[PDB]
Symmetry: C3
Subunit: 330 residues, 3 copies
């Protein structure tokens, strides 16, 4: 029958167009992919002044709120902190959340099994006028974290300027690319701010813009802390010029339930010697966690992939025709 | 032929059952796989007090033995240290491991090519009563690390509490998950220790338990340093509810030969100004290296993968039937 | 026909040799692959003395130029720095690049929108004899980074010694390997330096050698900063003995445009209390960025992969015969 032959030729044409227009065009079968090597260097340029009761004005420059000062990919930008000044080792009362004692016999000398704050001397001393806590041996100025300021201390960090410099290189093709594309120039970086539509190539990112693009409010996030994920994808075709190679920035919001362990926080201390006595300043820093992950691939024409793909296509076409014949006659 | 037909029916049934069950359900062919974006937050809550000879009791807290303040995937917990207090830059004797001089003519003005300890002035000064070393310019108190304390100074760091906060999100499926699963509540985190048999979901990990689960004894690993690797896997089946997916924690121990480079150690210093003179304290810290690696895969039903797998199965089935016929023919 | 039979036999033997030698032996189809986990430990043994105008001789040791104290995969080695000493918070003039004022009416009280240096009081004060800058609130000794010393302050860091400790393990096969191979003994590390041909397994890497093998001159990188990528690959066959497993060390140079953001730079501060007043030292460090990435794969014989490869090979063989027959029919 002529109709059977027409259907067979239609199936043959369909599979013959499919194999090429998919593997070669859509999937880039003739190209070869290699993993890149990336190093992320970040620089923060902004200032936030925090004034606390009983203390003088505090200046927080880049070195302050950026704790990974060595330009690590994963960095934390300080937005709120609790400061305990002039901590010195000695005999003093512990925190009330650790334990509450009504008499000296209640306290037991030794180390706490869980959440240890200090070596208990064995006496019950008044933490304040109302309650009494067991005396411990440690930094005497207590780190009270029960009161967290509702307005963020470093609330100016919302609309700061964040510079991200990423250099990627493909070892297979020996091609090195950087996020500073040829479209970006020196005068451009002076005033540009990153935008998904307006300024996609501008390497200067606003912290508030980055947080809002991830889906999180900066005000609520700055109080308790947060995690923001930044991904840079390098998808380019090496058959074209290297000018077309441009990085794509995607912001992902890493958050969780506020009822259980809200925000991100950590503690660091600055050790100094004053009046011949070793003292330190303890800060419970509530800051946003920024993680930068770079992944990408580059494709360039090669004979071996093209040949293998041609062979696979022939095999698919041959199998399809034989299978069609089995369907037609059985 | 009847037997040929029976063999063909059997082969067809076998290959059909295979292509319908294995690749479809066992391999999750109908589902699509994607990656996740992860960020690890670690917190150490523990207290260790060391009483070095000739010094006062030293208290170590979270800011002390956790050298990464913000908290990275790779962090070191201090277990043993060698302290060289009050280092000042001047002309003084070097360490005997560098070289031993019997006369002043032996020393040469310059710097050593390998393992340089300072700028040699060309003079031979007695390091102690017995031997003499060439005078160098630098920190006069040399870190004498020939003697390592047999009992770990921070031996209490064995059964401390370690909390790991991991937030993973899949971009294509827009699903965000955290290690704090629905089963874990606020009261649960108050009193729980990670036990793979009893408490697999408890996010609080005991350091000694983590070290023992890696195949290493904590005492020798602490007195000399070591490396412990922790992996978190997120295998989720998005066809079910999100509560079904739970993180799986695996502890792998990274160890080497004790004869060559035993354990892990590093050098850090704290700079201070006392009596108008710049001084520092040098610590040779022997600590366990903890690395957190998070990798996961999620699969959800989709029409395109299902269709491709069905088509592939038909092709495999078709090839198998043709092959069976050829085998029967010959 | 005889020639048709010869062509058929030739195609048969060709596809047989292919399926038996390429996908089985050359590609190790019978083996199975599993990813490894790695933790990198780095240690620098070098000393550089920098003499600056006004300040005394400054001695820099391992703890100094290596800012990551514990030691991560990404670390910075200080090669050049700009030191601003005795920074104290107060009302004082800003940098000329931030803004130049000719009258007090020009300055406006507030903070700069971009690249803020301090809180402008609103009075134009002379920065020096010629120009005047608006008075700001912050660290009064301003970092004047316009003048970069042409000779690197730390140029001796070229031919220093760098030791990399990498411990890898495969969880599937429970085999742990370290970069210290059995050929590397204790006496070997004392007198070996890494080379591509001479000492491929020596774990001591010269910084200048690493920089030069990446295609970069050490002086240009020491002047304005640099980024160097190190990759350690673990390609071994677990069918052989573990002694054959040897890591491969190669260095990748992440080049950057000289006119736009040359090199890598960062800023850190050391806080100290002197004479009861809080002061700090600000350093703008132009240090080379060293990134270490480990990617390895191990293969061991298994029955399931061997069977699948045999089956796939038979399928390819069958398809080829059918295709050949179709061509003969045509
Ligand atoms: N966080 C940032 N916000 C805005 N601009 C930045 C930021 N980081 C860098 N830049 C600009 O990018 C250009 C190149 O930066 P580079 O790494 O050379 O720093 P630099 O110019 O050496 O240091 P500085 O900016 O302190 O002079 C500089 O002109 C700088 O003004
Ligand atoms: N390493 C740890 N060991 C034991 N419990 C921990 C640890 N880290 C956090 N937790 C507990 O988990 C709960 C939620 O964690 P969260 O991030 O709120 O800590 P936190 O309350 O800020 O720390 P802290 O209890 O020191 O004030 C807290 O009540 C805390 O006590
Ligand atoms: N960066 C380096 N350059 C040259 N040799 C090194 C380097 N790091 C380590 N070594 C050598 O490797 C040997 C073993 O190092 P290991 O990790 O045991 O340090 P250590 O001997 O405990 O401490 P240190 O080497 O600081 O005295 C040492 O004898 C040392 O000489
Ligand atoms: C004393 O401290 C406890 C701690 O919980 C607090 O509840 C109480 O109000 C304090 N009393 C005074 C008088 O400050
Ligand atoms: C937002 O950016 C503007 C820049 O025009 C700045 O004036 C403002 O202070 C920023 N907001 C916060 C909360 O810092
Ligand atoms: C600077 O870069 C921008 C990119 O948006 C471009 O439009 C502009 O022409 C560039 N300036 C010069 C002087 O080339
Ligand atoms: C002097 O130092 C050397 C260094 O190895 C040591 O061997 C020797 O015992 C020391 N002598 C005394 C008396 O401490
Ligand atoms: C082990 O844990 C127990 C908790 O009951 C604690 O008392 C003990 O001190 C721990 N061991 C060490 C060596 O710290
Ligand atoms: C707390 O979590 C545990 C998980 O093991 C659960 O058994 C317990 O019921 C939870 N407590 C409450 C009050 O829900
Ligand atoms: C004052 O500082 C400016 C800053 O650009 C500089 O150009 C000028 O030469 C300086 N004048 C003197 C006398 O140092
Ligand atoms: C290069 O290495 C040699 C070792 O013989 C050393 O003397 C020299 O100072 C090194 N060069 C630099 C610039 O440090
Ligand atoms: C030390 O290692 C080297 C590796 O190059 C080897 O040639 C030498 O024989 C080893 N020394 C001893 C004493 O085994
Ligand atoms: Ca650090
Ligand atoms: Ca890291
Ligand atoms: Ca096929
Ligand atoms: Ca001080
Ligand atoms: Mg608390
Ligand atoms: Mg030593
Ligand atoms: Mg500048």
């Amino acid at each position: 029958n002529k109709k059977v032959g027409v259907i067979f030729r239609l199936i043959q044409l369909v599979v013959l167009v499919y194999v090429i227009g998919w593997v070669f065009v859509y999937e880039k079968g003739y190209q070869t992919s290699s993993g890149l090597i990336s190093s992320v260097s970040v620089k923060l340029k902004g200032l936030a002044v925090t004034q606390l009761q009983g203390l003088g004005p505090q200046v927080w420059d880049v070195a302050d709120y950026v704790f990974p000062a060595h330009g690590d990919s994963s960095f934390v930008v300080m937005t709120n902190f609790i400061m305990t000044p002039q901590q010195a080792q000695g005999h003093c009362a512990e925190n009330p959340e650790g334990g509450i004692c009504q008499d000296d016999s209640g306290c037991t000398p030794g180390k706490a099994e869980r959440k240890a704050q200090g070596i208990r001397t064995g006496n019950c001393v008044p933490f304040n006028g109302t309650v009494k806590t067991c005396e411990i041996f440690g930094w005497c100025p207590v780190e009270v974290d029960d009161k967290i300021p509702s307005p963020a201390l470093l609330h100016e960090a919302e609309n700061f300027t964040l510079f991200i410099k990423n250099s990627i290189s493909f070892p297979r093709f020996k091609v090195n690319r950087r996020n500073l594309v040829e479209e970006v120039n020196g005068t451009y970086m002076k005033k540009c701010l990153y935008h998904k539509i307006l300024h996609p190539l501008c390497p200067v990112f606003s912290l508030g813009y980055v947080v809002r693009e991830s889906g999180q409010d900066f005000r609520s996030l700055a109080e308790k802390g947060g995690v923001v994920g930044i991904t840079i994808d390098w998808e380019c075709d090496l058959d074209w010029h290297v000018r077309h190679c441009k990085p794509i920035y995607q912001f992902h919001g890493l958050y969780g339930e506020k009822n259980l362990s809200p925000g991100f926080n950590f503690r660091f201390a600055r050790h100094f010697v004053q009046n011949g006595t070793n003292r330190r300043h303890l800060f419970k820093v509530f800051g946003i966690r920024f993680d930068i992950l770079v992944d990408g691939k580059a494709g360039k024409f090669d004979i071996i992939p093209t040949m293998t793909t041609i062979g696979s296509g022939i095999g698919i076409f041959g199998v399809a025709t034989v299978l069609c014949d089995l369907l037609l006659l059985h």
